Design a protein around this ligand. Sequence first.
Ligand code: HEM
Length: 81
Amino acid sequence: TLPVFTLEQVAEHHSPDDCWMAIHGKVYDLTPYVPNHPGPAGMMLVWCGQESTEAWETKSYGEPHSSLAARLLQRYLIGTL
Ligand code: HEM
């Protein structure tokens, strides 16, 4: 069954070399994905350790992530919030 985390635990993984996020009530360990993120360098890094649903939904300027990107995000799932 999926592990359950709190936002406080997610916040301990807040750096480029140890980056977890909470998106839509789910927790993801995105550390391996960090260097592969497309777009302007370092946009995902500001959200390591955070609840990041709005940034996920809008890319911070008003475009959603694609269905392809949503499949890629799900691979890094580690639990629920
Ligand atoms: C949560 C904070 C995130 C922010 C603010 C963010 C922002 C962005 C931006 C600015 C771009 C380029 C512009 C554009 O494609 O319209 C982009 C593209 C992309 N991002 Fe993110 N991203 C985030 C997280 C993620 C995560 C967690 C993944 C997957 C593991 C991901 C996967 C991708 C992919 C695959 C693209 C290429 C375009 C697409 O398929 O939608 N991003 N992102």
